Design an enzyme around this catalytic site. Structure first.
Site, mmCIF file in Angstrom:
data_model
loop_
_atom_site.group_PDB
_atom_site.id
_atom_site.type_symbol
_atom_site.label_atom_id
_atom_site.label_comp_id
_atom_site.label_asym_id
_atom_site.label_seq_id
_atom_site.Cartn_x
_atom_site.Cartn_y
_atom_site.Cartn_z
ATOM 1 N N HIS B 67 62.980 -30.205 -8.592
ATOM 2 C CA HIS B 67 63.151 -28.530 -8.697
ATOM 3 C C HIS B 67 63.633 -27.964 -7.264
ATOM 4 O O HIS B 67 62.638 -27.820 -6.361
ATOM 5 C CB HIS B 67 61.185 -28.026 -8.761
ATOM 6 C CG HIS B 67 61.427 -28.142 -10.423
ATOM 7 N ND1 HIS B 67 59.896 -29.002 -10.753
ATOM 8 C CD2 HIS B 67 61.771 -28.904 -11.091
ATOM 9 C CE1 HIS B 67 59.762 -28.653 -12.480
ATOM 10 N NE2 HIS B 67 61.349 -28.996 -12.618
ATOM 11 N N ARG B 69 64.571 -24.856 -6.406
ATOM 12 C CA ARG B 69 63.688 -24.069 -5.482
ATOM 13 C C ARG B 69 62.621 -24.116 -4.456
ATOM 14 O O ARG B 69 62.087 -23.532 -3.517
ATOM 15 C CB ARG B 69 63.395 -22.898 -6.453
ATOM 16 C CG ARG B 69 62.505 -23.020 -7.529
ATOM 17 C CD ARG B 69 62.465 -21.392 -7.943
ATOM 18 N NE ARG B 69 61.088 -21.593 -9.198
ATOM 19 C CZ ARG B 69 61.391 -21.404 -10.455
ATOM 20 N NH1 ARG B 69 62.263 -21.107 -10.566
ATOM 21 N NH2 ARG B 69 60.547 -22.244 -10.994
ATOM 22 N N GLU B 70 61.663 -25.656 -4.370
ATOM 23 C CA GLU B 70 61.294 -26.420 -3.636
ATOM 24 C C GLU B 70 61.283 -26.334 -2.214
ATOM 25 O O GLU B 70 61.019 -27.603 -1.863
ATOM 26 C CB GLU B 70 60.023 -26.448 -4.953
ATOM 27 C CG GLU B 70 59.736 -25.848 -6.071
ATOM 28 C CD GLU B 70 59.075 -27.120 -6.898
ATOM 29 O OE1 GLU B 70 58.562 -28.834 -6.263
ATOM 30 O OE2 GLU B 70 58.968 -26.974 -8.394
ATOM 31 N N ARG B 125 65.832 -23.809 -11.106
ATOM 32 C CA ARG B 125 64.942 -24.318 -10.506
ATOM 33 C C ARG B 125 65.616 -25.634 -11.584
ATOM 34 O O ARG B 125 65.492 -26.846 -11.465
ATOM 35 C CB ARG B 125 63.910 -24.078 -11.829
ATOM 36 C CG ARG B 125 63.344 -24.709 -12.521
ATOM 37 C CD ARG B 125 62.195 -24.913 -13.953
ATOM 38 N NE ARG B 125 61.276 -25.121 -14.209
ATOM 39 C CZ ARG B 125 59.686 -26.013 -13.452
ATOM 40 N NH1 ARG B 125 59.729 -25.802 -12.555
ATOM 41 N NH2 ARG B 125 58.890 -26.614 -14.086
ATOM 42 N N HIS B 194 57.088 -31.687 -4.985
ATOM 43 C CA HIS B 194 57.155 -30.681 -5.476
ATOM 44 C C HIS B 194 56.528 -29.631 -5.008
ATOM 45 O O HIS B 194 55.887 -30.344 -4.005
ATOM 46 C CB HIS B 194 56.300 -30.930 -7.284
ATOM 47 C CG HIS B 194 57.837 -30.976 -8.177
ATOM 48 N ND1 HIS B 194 58.580 -30.603 -9.095
ATOM 49 C CD2 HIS B 194 57.131 -32.221 -8.517
ATOM 50 C CE1 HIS B 194 58.570 -31.462 -9.310
ATOM 51 N NE2 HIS B 194 58.528 -32.970 -9.894
ATOM 52 N N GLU B 268 51.860 -31.631 -5.237
ATOM 53 C CA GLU B 268 52.396 -30.044 -5.268
ATOM 54 C C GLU B 268 51.881 -29.680 -4.306
ATOM 55 O O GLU B 268 50.847 -29.454 -3.344
ATOM 56 C CB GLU B 268 51.731 -29.328 -5.993
ATOM 57 C CG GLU B 268 51.853 -29.594 -7.803
ATOM 58 C CD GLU B 268 53.800 -29.033 -7.599
ATOM 59 O OE1 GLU B 268 54.109 -28.160 -7.140
ATOM 60 O OE2 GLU B 268 54.189 -29.131 -8.589
HETATM 61 C C1 LIG Z 1 60.918 -17.487 -15.408
HETATM 62 C C2 LIG Z 1 59.389 -17.402 -15.283
HETATM 63 O O1 LIG Z 1 59.684 -18.255 -13.605
HETATM 64 N N1 LIG Z 1 57.837 -17.483 -15.295
HETATM 65 C C3 LIG Z 1 57.816 -16.977 -16.985
HETATM 66 C C4 LIG Z 1 56.300 -16.870 -17.221
HETATM 67 C C5 LIG Z 1 56.594 -18.397 -17.512
HETATM 68 C C6 LIG Z 1 54.912 -18.597 -18.189
HETATM 69 C C7 LIG Z 1 57.377 -18.877 -18.578
HETATM 70 C C8 LIG Z 1 58.285 -15.770 -16.447
HETATM 71 O O2 LIG Z 1 58.303 -14.728 -16.017
HETATM 72 N N2 LIG Z 1 59.948 -14.978 -17.433
HETATM 73 C C9 LIG Z 1 59.217 -13.136 -17.903
HETATM 74 C C10 LIG Z 1 61.077 -13.254 -18.138
HETATM 75 P P1 LIG Z 1 57.798 -12.171 -18.493
HETATM 76 O O3 LIG Z 1 58.582 -10.855 -18.805
HETATM 77 O O4 LIG Z 1 56.851 -12.653 -17.942
HETATM 78 C C11 LIG Z 1 58.013 -12.593 -20.267
HETATM 79 C C12 LIG Z 1 56.174 -12.273 -21.164
HETATM 80 C C13 LIG Z 1 56.443 -12.688 -22.733
HETATM 81 C C14 LIG Z 1 57.295 -11.885 -23.278
HETATM 82 C C15 LIG Z 1 56.696 -10.373 -23.788
HETATM 83 C C16 LIG Z 1 56.708 -9.205 -22.740
HETATM 84 C C17 LIG Z 1 56.542 -8.241 -23.099
HETATM 85 C C18 LIG Z 1 55.291 -7.750 -24.105
HETATM 86 C C19 LIG Z 1 54.553 -8.850 -24.739
HETATM 87 C C20 LIG Z 1 55.513 -10.738 -24.342
HETATM 88 C C21 LIG Z 1 56.091 -13.209 -20.670
HETATM 89 O O5 LIG Z 1 55.675 -14.177 -20.254
HETATM 90 O O6 LIG Z 1 54.459 -11.811 -20.328
HETATM 91 C C1 LIG Z 2 53.660 -20.934 -10.940
HETATM 92 C C2 LIG Z 2 55.082 -20.542 -11.284
HETATM 93 O O1 LIG Z 2 55.829 -19.037 -11.111
HETATM 94 N N1 LIG Z 2 56.855 -21.455 -12.467
HETATM 95 C C3 LIG Z 2 56.233 -22.518 -12.457
HETATM 96 C C4 LIG Z 2 56.708 -23.184 -13.904
HETATM 97 C C5 LIG Z 2 54.869 -23.255 -15.015
HETATM 98 C C6 LIG Z 2 54.826 -22.022 -15.591
HETATM 99 C C7 LIG Z 2 56.176 -23.442 -16.851
HETATM 100 C C8 LIG Z 2 56.421 -23.356 -11.432
HETATM 101 O O2 LIG Z 2 58.168 -23.759 -11.329
HETATM 102 N N2 LIG Z 2 55.949 -24.560 -11.604
HETATM 103 C C9 LIG Z 2 56.224 -25.752 -10.409
HETATM 104 C C10 LIG Z 2 54.163 -25.284 -8.740
HETATM 105 P P1 LIG Z 2 56.653 -26.552 -10.935
HETATM 106 O O3 LIG Z 2 56.895 -27.986 -9.582
HETATM 107 O O4 LIG Z 2 57.282 -26.975 -11.922
HETATM 108 C C11 LIG Z 2 54.955 -27.892 -11.867
HETATM 109 C C12 LIG Z 2 54.869 -28.670 -12.232
HETATM 110 C C13 LIG Z 2 53.859 -29.390 -12.785
HETATM 111 C C14 LIG Z 2 53.888 -31.479 -14.028
HETATM 112 C C15 LIG Z 2 54.630 -31.414 -12.978
HETATM 113 C C16 LIG Z 2 54.537 -32.306 -11.349
HETATM 114 C C17 LIG Z 2 55.194 -33.020 -10.915
HETATM 115 C C18 LIG Z 2 55.265 -34.295 -11.909
HETATM 116 C C19 LIG Z 2 55.219 -35.031 -12.916
HETATM 117 C C20 LIG Z 2 54.473 -33.274 -13.726
HETATM 118 C C21 LIG Z 2 55.932 -28.440 -13.684
HETATM 119 O O5 LIG Z 2 55.959 -27.853 -14.319
HETATM 120 O O6 LIG Z 2 57.224 -29.444 -13.815
HETATM 121 ZN ZN LIG Z 3 58.751 -28.652 -9.365
#
Ligand SMILES: CC(=O)N[C@@H](CC(C)C)C(=O)N[C@@H](C)P(=O)(O)C[C@@H](CCc1ccccc1)C(=O)O
Ligand SMILES: CC(=O)N[C@@H](CC(C)C)C(=O)N[C@@H](C)P(=O)(O)C[C@@H](CCc1ccccc1)C(=O)O
Ligand SMILES: [Zn+2]
Ligand SMILES: [Zn+2]
Lengths: 307, 306
Positions: B67, B69-70, B125, B194, B268
């Site tokens: 990943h 950005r890590e 990512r 990670h 992590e």
């Molecule tokens: C892209 C990322 O790293 N994280 C995601 C959340 C993760 C759980 C995949 C994110 O920040 N996504 C943004 C685009 P978000 O804006 O936060 C999307 C909304 C879901 C849709 C929504 C918007 C407004 C009202 C109701 C539902 C969310 O996860 O809250």
């Molecule tokens: C927390 C956040 O802002 N974003 C999440 C994405 C998530 C909400 C969908 C993230 O990038 N999290 C990182 C810390 P990640 O590093 O990418 C976490 C791992 C966890 C599972 C794993 C890690 C390492 C080996 C095998 C399985 C992931 O989601 O891939």
């Molecule tokens: Zn990761």
């Protein structure tokens, strides 16, 4: 500074947006007012702008940006929107029609503690800044904290998670202030919550797959809003229910507002689709806001003509 | 020159690649550089082999930066590599490790993404592959593995951060490693690093069913996090992926452990969200040092259990 000399193509600080609100009020004393709806966990004031040409609690549009603080293009667009309203009123016939009947409430910094934190410490802060006992983690996802399928599949019980739902619905003062304001107002006809990014216009629900009763109308309005939006620079938005268009999300905003009877409940996800994501260049601020305004107009005209 | 290299700041891809070369030239009888592929965008993928001899000796695999950005991970991978050359022949316990085991270190496991984080989007990512019939780009390399691929814990949405791709190993960056491991056939430990969250985890992420080696891996985990905490007091939790964080399908160590690599772990690193991915450079060296100590525990234990 005045609102005419303000730089709209730049990202601003909390203090700058707050001073902008005061300039807007002082420059339009018979059009714009600023309402304090609460204080944040950390003590900062939460402010909503009211755009009104008269009456007593006219039917209204609510628009909020910046609920997830890192989504900077949203607060920026929110500032632009404020200045678009004041320039356009009394000048543009269509828009003058909208504001001769409807009030508009605009919450530019909907998560102020987070916003301040994106500036001082962590550009990617999402959540509120409320403390959580027994955790090394801080804050609650404001978009998981509403009383609509709260706690259900589509949010996290883990304080460390980006989608942590909090101890109970409305635990976050930043959410309950909106809830209180909405319920007391009683005349809010449309509710639009603005996020970035992904280029989506959505309607309920995010918590369950079952379609909302106003699905045809909402979807049809959605298609016209994104068509209007696309007309300007060719920017493509997709549309649909939150659950079908992005993913399941429980205790999310428009699910609550919609179940409160507010039929025109919408969320935008703005530019881009991931190239820059949240780190969208300042040079895309005004284009973003301008094309989204076209969509807002579509939805507001609909609202105007359908009591 | 690797002595004058600045370990307490974040580097570009070119700076890391130049570091690989300087370390190999300074230590050619110990460190060799292996190309396992080229990225989607055609850039070489490099792994450092640290070895005292033999042929396909039992081996430890360590990767960082899958990943992209890590940033603390790549930066700790750089430190790990210098660390290996510094201690080999001076620290008695690490000497014994490398006298029996080979070590492979992939520092920039997602080069396209890493370059993107520097040129365009600090928060990229995924890989940078193009997706047929979509505007969105890239696949989550931590969902693209042939273990529960496409099942709960990943997305079929190309625009998703956890988009799994069309098929398992579609991403060249993941297939290069697969091909490497299968060809080698004698990796005894595989550690994917990670950030962030401060966690040490073992399989599975794709299901709740515990691995038959859970008892042993949990005890090792206990030991590794204590070793880690000894320097600064940094508190790591540990468990199976699915219990310690959330379900994730087609993830790395699930596949490795299924190949029969018993000591499959993921870290992590710092912190717990205050700075998240954006961890200050001043924390790179303290992160690397503490993490090495847990790596050491896993490595010694692997040595003592042929
Ligand atoms: C892209 C990322 O790293 N994280 C995601 C959340 C993760 C759980 C995949 C994110 O920040 N996504 C943004 C685009 P978000 O804006 O936060 C999307 C909304 C879901 C849709 C929504 C918007 C407004 C009202 C109701 C539902 C969310 O996860 O809250
Ligand atoms: C927390 C956040 O802002 N974003 C999440 C994405 C998530 C909400 C969908 C993230 O990038 N999290 C990182 C810390 P990640 O590093 O990418 C976490 C791992 C966890 C599972 C794993 C890690 C390492 C080996 C095998 C399985 C992931 O989601 O891939
Ligand atoms: Zn990761
Ligand atoms: Zn958001």
């Amino acid at each position: 500074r005045s609102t005419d000399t303000f730089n709209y193509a730049t990202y601003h600080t909390l203090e700058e947006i707050y001073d902008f609100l005061d300039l807007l009020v002082a420059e339009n004393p018979h059009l714009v007012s600023k309402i304090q709806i609460g204080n944040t966990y950390e003590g900062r004031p939460i402010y909503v702008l009211k755009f009104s040409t008269g009456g007593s609690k006219r039917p209204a549009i609510w628009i909020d940006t910046g609920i997830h603080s890192r989504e900077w293009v949203t607060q920026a667009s929110g500032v632009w929107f404020a200045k678009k309203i004041t320039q356009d009123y009394g000048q543009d016939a269509a828009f003058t029609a909208i504001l001769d009947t409807l009030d508009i409430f605009l919450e530019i910094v909907t998560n102020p503690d987070g916003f301040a934190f994106t500036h001082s410490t962590n550009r990617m802060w999402r959540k509120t800044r409320s403390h959580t006992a027994g955790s090394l983690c801080i804050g609650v996802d404001p978009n998981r904290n509403w009383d609509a399928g709260f706690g259900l599949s589509g949010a996290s019980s883990n304080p460390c998670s980006e989608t942590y739902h909090g101890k109970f619905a409305n635990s976050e003062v930043e959410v309950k202030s909106i809830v209180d304001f909405v319920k007391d107002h009683g005349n809010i006809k449309a509710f639009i919550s603005i996020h970035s990014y992904s280029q989506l216009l959505m309607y309920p629900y995010g918590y369950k797959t079952e379609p909302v009763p106003d699905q045809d109308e909402l979807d049809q309005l959605s298609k016209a809003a994104v068509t209007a939006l696309a007309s300007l620079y060719g920017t493509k938005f997709n549309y649909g229910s939150i659950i079908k268009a992005i993913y399941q999300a429980s205790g999310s905003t428009i699910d609550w507002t919609y179940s409160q009877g507010i039929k025109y409940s919408f969320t935008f996800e703005l530019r881009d689709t991931g190239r820059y994501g949240f780190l969208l260049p300042a040079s895309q601020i005004i284009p973003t806001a301008k094309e989204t305004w076209l969509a807002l107009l579509t939805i507001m005209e609909h609202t105007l003509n359908h009591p």
